[PDB]
């Protein structure tokens, strides 16, 4: 759903596509305007985080669906933060869908398609060459990011249920937030109705995807989207 | 603005009054219903915090403006948490009123009327007989309390600008949140207009106090007082 176009040693173009994929590509569709929506939401979120002192890969915009981002040496991780029980957490804790967690939960996943992104702990992370000190910094940033996004969205009647982040190292060795932040990579629920406003609408045919993504955008910006 | 009526060794009654005082009692007024509103908001906040595992002195209600609280050995502190630049923080940081802080700020003040509650640090605290370990627990609780109150109020279009907390020790030596939590001890701004919905309305004659306090109550409860 993204194309990464290299510019040079320190920069690249992240291009968002209208393609939607789920269940290892066994389920596919195209949603006109999805890419535009995901790119724009990523811009909103990254700038918001930058305002709070979070270091992100975001440099600028190069078109409706194209972002310019700094090239990073990526950690082979998906860093998942969870505020409300949903998806795979139901397989892990004896709690129902929708349960509000007393504190946010951080899960680490080894980014590996062949092993289907298995969950790992700090010991596994060391074997994969990630020091405990780096892990602690990563989780700390992820939790800060969580609070900013959660609070921002909560004021707009949107529950940040959970989300995945990715991180990399820049030239100076600092840990930098990367990839995307969109309804493709977050679970967003309406505060009142608890309906999904994210990729789960596609994954489980719970409704109209472009409709859901437009809803997020309009609530955040105060404006209907024009792709 | 409160009367503390002792019951026995472990309990007391905190009575909220309609009296309002500012600038060392050089400015005084009475606001019909203020005490009731402060007592009720204190109940709402303490119960909210108790729900999240915060230990508080709140036991129960003994009338519209009377709370039953557990008696504590008080720390001689005001513990102030700040999310948004206002009041005395403007004298300390080169930042305008309304500036949103990247992270919450915790300030300690020594509770002493004659010295007009001066700001202190961890070294001064130790002299006043408060260990660094206690201080760290205090600030940790204060930051937890901040996050719950801020998030709760934000969903209701209210900015938690800053607020004062007080703490004491119970019989078992645990650190327990005490005093009150009300528009007398917090700065609350309307999210859209940024107008004060707290004691600043009285302090600086920015409007109608009872109006501002009723507004807070109605937004929280969904009911007119
Ligand atoms: N649970 C408690 N146990 C003992 N003292 C308390 C408790 N809660 C509050 N206090 C103290 O009771 C007093 C009530 O506040 P207030 O009437 O405004 O007094 P003051 O104006 O001197 O701060 C304060 O001195 C406060 O520190
Ligand atoms: N490979 C991935 N791509 C995009 N988002 C993901 C990925 N893995 C997990 N997430 C997000 O992380 C959260 C938790 O997913 P799950 O573990 O399936 O419950 C959800 O918001 C997902 O959208
Ligand atoms: N700043 C970055 N530098 C280098 N690689 C990145 C950066 N941000 C994201 N990526 C990777 O680019 C790929 C694009 O995601 P996908 O659309 O799943 O192919 C993923 O492998 C990401 O880990
Ligand atoms: N002695 C006090 N009595 C009541 N509230 C206070 C006191 N000191 C500080 N506060 C509260 O803590 C915050 C910071 O106050 P200041 O340092 O006066 O700007 C404000 O919300 C005040 O209402």
UniProtKB/Swiss-Prot annotation, chain A:
InterPro entries per record: SAICAR_synt/ADE2_N, SAICAR_synt_PurC, SAICAR_synth, SAICAR_synthetase, SAICAR_synthetase_CS
Annotated GO biological process: 'de novo' IMP biosynthetic process; cobalamin biosynthetic process
Gene Ontology molecular functions: ATP binding; phosphoribosylaminoimidazolesuccinocarboxamide synthase activity
Presence of the UniProt keyword Nucleotide-binding in the record: yes
CDD domains: SAICAR_synt_PurC
Annotated metabolic or biological route of this protein: Purine metabolism; IMP biosynthesis via de novo pathway; 5-amino-1-(5-phospho-D-ribosyl)imidazole-4-carboxamide from 5-amino-1-(5-phospho-D-ribosyl)imidazole-4-carboxylate: step 1/2
Matches recorded under Pfam families: SAICAR_synt
Catalytic reactions on record: 5-amino-1-(5-phospho-D-ribosyl)imidazole-4-carboxylate + L-aspartate + ATP = (2S)-2-[5-amino-1-(5-phospho-beta-D-ribosyl)imidazole-4-carboxamido]succinate + ADP + phosphate + 2 H(+)
PROSITE patterns in the cross-refs: SAICAR_SYNTHETASE_1, SAICAR_SYNTHETASE_2
Keywords, sorted A to Z: ATP-binding, Ligase, Nucleotide-binding, Purine biosynthesis
EC number: 6.3.2.6
Ranges that cross the membrane: none
NCBIfam families, per database record: purC
Family the UniProt entry places it in: Belongs to the SAICAR synthetase family.
Protein name: Phosphoribosylaminoimidazole-succinocarboxamide synthase
Gene: purC
Swiss-Prot record, chain B:
Family statement drawn from the similarity comment of this UniProt entry: Belongs to the SAICAR synthetase family.
Gene3D superfamilies tied to this protein: ATP-grasp fold, B domain, Phosphorylase Kinase, domain 1
GO biological process: 'de novo' IMP biosynthetic process; cobalamin biosynthetic process
Signal peptide interval: none
Record's protein name: Phosphoribosylaminoimidazole-succinocarboxamide synthase
Keywords: ATP-binding, Ligase, Nucleotide-binding, Purine biosynthesis
Transmembrane segments: none
Keyword Lipid metabolism appears in the UniProt entry: no
Known pathway: Purine metabolism; IMP biosynthesis via de novo pathway; 5-amino-1-(5-phospho-D-ribosyl)imidazole-4-carboxamide from 5-amino-1-(5-phospho-D-ribosyl)imidazole-4-carboxylate: step 1/2
Catalysed reactions, semicolon-separated: 5-amino-1-(5-phospho-D-ribosyl)imidazole-4-carboxylate + L-aspartate + ATP = (2S)-2-[5-amino-1-(5-phospho-beta-D-ribosyl)imidazole-4-carboxamido]succinate + ADP + phosphate + 2 H(+)
A single MF term (Gene Ontology): ATP binding
Xref: Pfam families: SAICAR_synt
CDD domains, per database record: SAICAR_synt_PurC
EC number(s) per entry: 6.3.2.6
Record keyword Nucleotide-binding present: yes
Organism: Pyrococcus horikoshii (strain ATCC 700860 / DSM 12428 / JCM 9974 / NBRC 100139 / OT-3)
């Amino acid at each position: 759903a993204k194309k990464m176009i290299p510019i040079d040693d320190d920069k690249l173009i992240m291009e968002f596509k209208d393609d939607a994929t789920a269940f290892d590509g066994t389920k596919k569709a195209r949603f006109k305007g999805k890419g535009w929506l995901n790119a724009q939401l990523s811009v909103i979120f990254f700038k918001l985080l930058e305002e709070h002192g979070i270091k992100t890969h975001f440099i600028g915009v190069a078109g409706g669906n194209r972002l310019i981002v700094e090239k990073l040496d990526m950690y082979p991780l998906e860093v998942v933060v969870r505020n409300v029980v949903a998806g795979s957490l139901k397989k892990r804790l004896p709690l129902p869908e929708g349960y509000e967690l007393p504190e946010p939960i951080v899960e680490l996943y080894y980014k590996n398609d062949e092993l289907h992104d298995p969950m790992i702990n700090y010991y596994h992370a060391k074997v994969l060459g990630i020091s405990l000190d780096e892990i602690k910094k990563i989780e700390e940033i992820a939790l800060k990011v969580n609070e900013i996004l959660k609070d921002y969205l909560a004021k707009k009647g949107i529950i940040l249920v959970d989300f995945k982040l990715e991180f990399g190292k820049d030239k100076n060795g600092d840990i930098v937030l990367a990839d995307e932040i969109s309804p493709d990579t977050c679970r967003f629920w309406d505060a009142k109705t608890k309906r999904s406003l994210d990729k789960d609408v596609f994954r489980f045919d719970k409704g109209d995807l472009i409709e859901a993504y437009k809803e997020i955008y309009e609530r955040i910006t105060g404006e209907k989207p024009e792709f």
